[PDB]
Design an enzyme around this catalytic site. Sequence first.
Site, PDB file in Angstrom:
ATOM      1  N   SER A 131      41.168  31.399  42.423  1.00  0.00           N
ATOM      2  CA  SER A 131      40.232  30.483  41.764  1.00  0.00           C
ATOM      3  C   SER A 131      40.699  30.351  40.319  1.00  0.00           C
ATOM      4  O   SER A 131      41.882  30.029  40.115  1.00  0.00           O
ATOM      5  CB  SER A 131      38.802  30.988  41.982  1.00  0.00           C
ATOM      6  OG  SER A 131      37.833  30.011  41.653  1.00  0.00           O
ATOM      7  N   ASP A 177      37.687  23.679  51.060  1.00  0.00           N
ATOM      8  CA  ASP A 177      37.219  24.146  49.762  1.00  0.00           C
ATOM      9  C   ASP A 177      36.326  23.099  49.114  1.00  0.00           C
ATOM     10  O   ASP A 177      36.745  21.962  48.880  1.00  0.00           O
ATOM     11  CB  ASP A 177      38.424  24.451  48.872  1.00  0.00           C
ATOM     12  CG  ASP A 177      38.065  25.272  47.636  1.00  0.00           C
ATOM     13  OD1 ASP A 177      36.935  25.138  47.109  1.00  0.00           O
ATOM     14  OD2 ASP A 177      38.937  26.046  47.183  1.00  0.00           O
ATOM     15  N   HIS A 209      36.463  28.188  50.131  1.00  0.00           N
ATOM     16  CA  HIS A 209      36.970  28.711  48.868  1.00  0.00           C
ATOM     17  C   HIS A 209      37.143  30.224  48.886  1.00  0.00           C
ATOM     18  O   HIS A 209      37.846  30.770  48.027  1.00  0.00           O
ATOM     19  CB  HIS A 209      36.027  28.331  47.736  1.00  0.00           C
ATOM     20  CG  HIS A 209      36.561  28.641  46.373  1.00  0.00           C
ATOM     21  ND1 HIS A 209      37.728  28.092  45.891  1.00  0.00           N
ATOM     22  CD2 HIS A 209      36.071  29.417  45.380  1.00  0.00           C
ATOM     23  CE1 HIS A 209      37.938  28.524  44.662  1.00  0.00           C
ATOM     24  NE2 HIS A 209      36.947  29.330  44.328  1.00  0.00           N
TER      25      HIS A 209
END
Length: 260
Positions: A131, A177, A209
């Site tokens: 991330s 995602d 995600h």
Amino acid sequence: AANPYERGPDPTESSLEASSGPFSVSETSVSRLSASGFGGGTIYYPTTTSEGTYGAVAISPGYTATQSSIAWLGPRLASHGFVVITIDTNTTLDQPDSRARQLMAALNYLVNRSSVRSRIDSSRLAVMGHSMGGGGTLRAAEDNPSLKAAIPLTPWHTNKNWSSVRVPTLIIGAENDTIAPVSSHAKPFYNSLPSSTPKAYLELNGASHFAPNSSNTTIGKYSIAWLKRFVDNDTRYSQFLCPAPHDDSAISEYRSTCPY
Ligand code: NA
Ligand code: NA
């Protein structure tokens, strides 16, 4: 014998998909106070030293996350012949460009101050993250061309132009995602990467995600393959990254006008 950085036996698909590589893995940790420039970490490393030193990898978590969300990468990569540090950040709310500085501080600690530094070859280093740590993995790659490899996992970043990155990058995004959607993050990042730098984009089918936060056979296999190929120059690992029919021992040569 020719490449002095090869470690472990000839890879196979099985050994890369397994939960553990050929090396037994010990671990240690640096506290947050002790750690200069990041929020402490855990260090995973091959117990054996008899085959030579190893490359090192720093891995960073994402926004509001700690090491526990990236923890499984530590033993997974370390067991294939790598010193790995899963860090925490100075605060959980650090933006990706901060995380890139902390990724480098972490490799700095590992090379110079850690109790396993004698086990590291300080010219063979790599960065990884999840991330906003993936965006931090990109920024750190652009600013330190001497890195050997970088692996952004479902990366996030407000900057979409990464044409100055001269480090081999493998970008793993997640098809579904909804937090860093590949159409506005992972895919633009990869398109802007230069064609002269070796690169790769791998999109996980159906993944969200949070695919990188749990043990994952695909993330595992292709990260190991990518680090072995570029942190070790291990060309035994090209068969997984560039699969071809001449990988079979029965076939000495194959050429085609593929893709058809
Ligand atoms: Na600190
Ligand atoms: Na062959």
